Design a protein around this ligand. Structure first.
Ligand SMILES: Cc1cc2nc3c(=O)[nH]c(=O)nc-3n(C[C@H](O)[C@H](O)[C@H](O)COP(=O)(O)OP(=O)(O)OC[C@H]3O[C@@H](n4cnc5c(N)ncnc54)[C@H](O)[C@@H]3O)c2cc1C
Ligand SMILES: Cc1cc2nc3c(=O)[nH]c(=O)nc-3n(C[C@H](O)[C@H](O)[C@H](O)COP(=O)(O)OP(=O)(O)OC[C@H]3O[C@@H](n4cnc5c(N)ncnc54)[C@H](O)[C@@H]3O)c2cc1C
Ligand SMILES: N[C@@H](Cc1c[nH]c2ccccc12)C(=O)O
Ligand SMILES: N[C@@H](Cc1c[nH]c2ccccc12)C(=O)O
Ligand SMILES: [Mg+2]
Ligand SMILES: [Mg+2]
Lengths: 412, 414
């Protein structure tokens, strides 16, 4: 028999936190808990690596704020993970274009009850024309701000919650932190506690379909080596994002809430060198926002540099990687030269590099913390159902509602 | 998001060898060549690993014979890969049944003129008790021989070509060798040659569908991170096994061949320890064949032990692994103890272990099979060990590659 009292599908931060709240409850004593994830490691969109075995880099989530994410900060402290300052909170090379929009967003601000539901592009193109609003929006380096899908009110929220651009609004006093050893250290800590309390992990299995089976459920899964597996459980939490809920047979979203749901792709590229050649330019711990395809360029101490893009520009770099490594590195070299106002020859070739593309990097909200299927009583858990859609903090908030909803299914 | 004159899907030993034959031909000067594979490394069912950083193990193919496999032997020499003696060619500790094995099999062999194409379990059970047949057959450790789809004729060929049991049909003349650094060194040798001649690799991309498009073909591919990709080519080789052919939209096997194909699952588990405890029993470089679910147990010098199963026993171990690593390892200790005749508590715990399950480890033909195929309509060529006399061996992949390169070069010329 492959069975369990409680089953959680998804071992990101949401699924693992669900598991930990449940095992804390006296009402779960003597119940068995099983956790599935289609990946071979837990963590989901938290993915830490060593670049050339020298320094730790974040391929997914990278930074947090005590002002915006107090539950995440508390989790770091509870599991004895050390934080370090995240330096990329100002631009040394602020333009008047950047300066204008600060003032532009302040003056346009009251028109947001009037027009706040139209797109951010349509909104801003009233101050001056359309051409002028394109130059202002581009200077913030997040291309998702150009989507029709993103409203003016949504964009003011995005802008004010990101460290590179937060001073454009009046959130210039928020502080930002990174993990010394990488956020995978927090994931490992939660996983270890969950295992020590008796939960059993089955990594490398993908859920394909769910069917109600009297008072319980039957799950069909597929291992990454082809092995088919059936699992029966009495209580089910689906701790996966909306994009993955839609791939099941569970009538998502109509049977779960009114909303529709959307997502953005994200791309990050990291490069190391034989010598930290940007110290002469005094670029260490600085971020440059530029119009060319790198968009946002970061220099991390004397260790490495990287760039970060979303939406159409993320898809641009992923297609460029597919056409060959050679041209990819040569394209980066050209755009590093433009951004620094020098020639191509002054920029060395790298020793090593690494990149990551996330087809559904941010999944958002277009609404209670966690969801229930009206008929079957399955619970859904994701950062996209919260006010912190797009952030680890949202995963923690959804997990605590979701584990609450399930504790009342068990005591009913 | 581009194109090529020639495309190869499949970077196993078949696909890489196809590319090597093509790039060697004068007829491909100036032609561009693109290679796709859904894994992030080349090799296919050849998978070498460094287990606990002290010894190299084979999770897929592991042995070859110069007498049975001359082309594979020549390939090893061409790329300067060094070989070493493979020890598991005799049973030092035979059971009673295993000693009767060769004489029973020698006496039964003439009756294969009448009851030839019969299932091998039936054949052997017609001339002894069926209870006595089950005992004879299982003493050889390959559970494929109990399958209704395996004739008595196929079984005699399987027994005679495997090093642990070849002595049962007087094929001891065959020597066996393994690779000194792993067969991944052969694979890296061909890959570097093909790359140095200008071929381009796209690993991590899975072919989902192909359609004719005037001149050539349009391919839909999915990266292992979601990125969809469309690729255009004028000449196409699918160097993938029949199980993977079936998942496409190419009418396999109807539009390709008059045969049918099956497969067997395979499973291997490797274990290392703080101390080579099996030396006390003189088990180093020896293989035991047992009735219990380990079936075939191997002791590699003083470095590690492993076990190898197929068919229902391979699925048995894979199901065991799904229920948890702890129950798996305790199950292994129980069966090691009964194999050696001692109590559970004298078998140590392992430092490290690794296992691999192949859902379609062996693919073969059920029915004068040509070594490569061609689509009746579209001119796509298929390449695989399964289309040869040597189905289930790397030597078949080398043979199939030669024929596929020829078919493709005749369509490129003219
Ligand atoms: C590039 C990038 C940068 C980011 N930076 C930050 C940041 O700086 N600060 C911040 O707060 N957040 C950041 N995030 C977001 C953060 O990563 C997410 O908000 C959070 O990790 C989501 O947690 P989750 O557990 O809800 O979902 P996930 O991390 O997505 O985990 C979901 C899990 O469910 C599994 N799964 C899915 N489907 C199925 C199925 N059918 N069967 C089985 N298993 C399945 C998946 O494998 C996955 O592990 C970033 C994200 C990206 C992509
Ligand atoms: C456990 C085990 C032990 C073995 N031991 C031996 C031995 O000792 N001696 C011996 O000679 N042979 C042995 N073999 C067999 C040997 O591994 C194979 O015969 C040979 O390697 C197969 O070569 P191939 O290139 O034709 O196919 P494969 O190795 O199977 O290569 C096929 C490739 O195509 C890829 N692919 C498939 N489908 C698709 C798709 N839709 N899109 C994209 N890409 C795709 C796969 O990822 C794979 O890389 C063993 C096999 C196994 C499983
Ligand atoms: N805030 C995360 C990801 C993200 C959330 N919302 C976004 C909107 C647009 C682009 C990225 C995001 C980051 O630091 O990158
Ligand atoms: N030759 C491979 C695989 C194989 C070929 N024919 C087989 C029949 C049964 C089991 C495995 C095989 C091995 O001996 O391991
Ligand atoms: Mg999760
Ligand atoms: Mg191949």
């Amino acid at each position: 028999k492959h069975s369990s009292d409680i089953c959680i599908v998804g071992a990101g931060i949401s699924g693992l936190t669900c598991a930990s709240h449940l095992l804390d409850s006296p009402a779960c004593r003597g119940l068995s808990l099983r956790i599935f994830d289609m990946q071979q490691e837990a963590g989901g969109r938290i993915r830490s690596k060593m670049l050339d075995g020298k320094a730790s880099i974040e391929l997914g989530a990278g930074r947090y704020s005590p002002q915006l994410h107090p539950h995440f900060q508390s989790a770091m402290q509870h599991y004895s993970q050390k934080s370090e300052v995240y330096p990329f909170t100002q631009l040394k090379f602020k333009s008047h274009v950047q300066q204008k929009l600060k003032r532009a967003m302040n003056e346009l601000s009251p028109r947001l009850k009037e027009h706040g539901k139209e797109s951010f592009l349509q909104f801003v193109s009233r101050y001056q024309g359309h051409d002028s609003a394109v130059g202002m929006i581009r200077s913030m380096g997040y291309d998702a701000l150009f989507l029709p899908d993103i409203s003016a009110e949504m964009a003011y929220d995005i802008v004010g919650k990101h460290p590179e651009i937060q001073s454009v609004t009046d959130n210039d006093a928020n502080q930002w932190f990174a993990a010394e050893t990488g956020f995978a250290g927090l994931i490992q800590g939660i996983k270890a506690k969950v295992k020590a309390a008796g939960a059993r992990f089955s990594l490398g299995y993908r859920l394909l379909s769910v069917r109600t089976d009297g008072d319980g459920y039957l799950l069909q899964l597929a291992g990454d080596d082809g092995w088919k597996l059936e699992h029966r459980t009495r209580h089910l939490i689906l701790a996966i994002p909306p994009s993955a809920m839609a791939g099941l047979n569970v009538d998502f979203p109509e049977a779960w809430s009114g909303a529709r749901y959307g997502s953005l792709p994200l791309f990050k590229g990291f490069l190391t060198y034989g010598e930290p050649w940007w110290l002469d330019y005094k670029l260490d711990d600085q971020v440059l926002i530029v119009d060319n395809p790198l968009r946002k360029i970061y220099f991390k101490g004397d260790k490495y540099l990287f760039f970060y893009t979303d939406s159409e520009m993320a898809n641009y770099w992923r297609g460029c990687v597919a056409e060959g490594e050679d041209g990819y590195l040569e394209q980066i070299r050209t755009h590093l030269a433009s951004a620094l106002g020098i020639v191509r020859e002054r920029i060395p070739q790298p020793l090593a590099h690494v990149h990551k593309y996330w087809a559904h990097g941010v999944e958002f909200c277009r609404h209670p913390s966690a969801l229930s299927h009206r008929d079957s009583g399955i619970i859904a858990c994701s950062d996209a159902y919260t006010e912190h859609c797009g952030w680890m903090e949202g995963g923690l908030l959804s997990a605590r509602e979701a584990s609450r909803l399930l504790l009342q299914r068990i005591a009913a």
